[PDB]
Amino acid sequence: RTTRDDLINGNSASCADVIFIYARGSTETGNLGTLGPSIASNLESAFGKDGVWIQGVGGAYRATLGDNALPRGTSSAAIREMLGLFQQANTKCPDATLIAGGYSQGAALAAASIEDLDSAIRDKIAGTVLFGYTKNLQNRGRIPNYPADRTKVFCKTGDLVCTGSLIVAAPHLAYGPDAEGPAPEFLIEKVRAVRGS
DSSP: OOOOTTTTTTTTTOOOEEEEEEEEOOOTTTTTTTTTHHHHHHHHHTTGGGGEEEEOOOOOOOOOOOGGGGTTBBBHHHHHHHHHHHHHHHHHOOOOOOEEEEHHHHHHHHHHHHHTOOHHHHEHHHHHHHHSOTTTTTTTTSSSSSOOOOOOOOOOOTTGGGEEEEEEEEGOOOOOHHHTTTTHHHHHHHHHHTTTO
């Protein structure tokens, strides 16, 4: 449901082929946030539970509001944990396709980690959906240093983080819809695009 540690407790003898690494937004609980369980499920329906690893960024990532104002979306300790979860996924299951997603500060974070990832590992993230990208303006809509055709930024109009400020407004929470539709679709579509039938 809201806490998911598939990678962390994952045993490589039994690696999943697809591995999702999600960064929840500010204030939420567990490591999955409000939108994560939705994606996880849509991903699982398409892959069977056995076929995909759902792992949320916990540890040093606190979802602390003030951090939304740190120089690059969040804190160093966050970028770090996410980066380490990428390495860990890569090292634990090398031949596995990776998907990463993020909402709010979670997405501020996901761009930060992917932007300074080892390119080779970064090479294997087939798709990344961001929700209410608090850095949507500053990074000109892309995740700096990721293939643009792999980035799906769900920035609903009316949401002010997408436009250049910390002003949280109503539309910033109108994301449940997309998290059960275009978001996991985009991912399953990108992963099947780099796998089979």
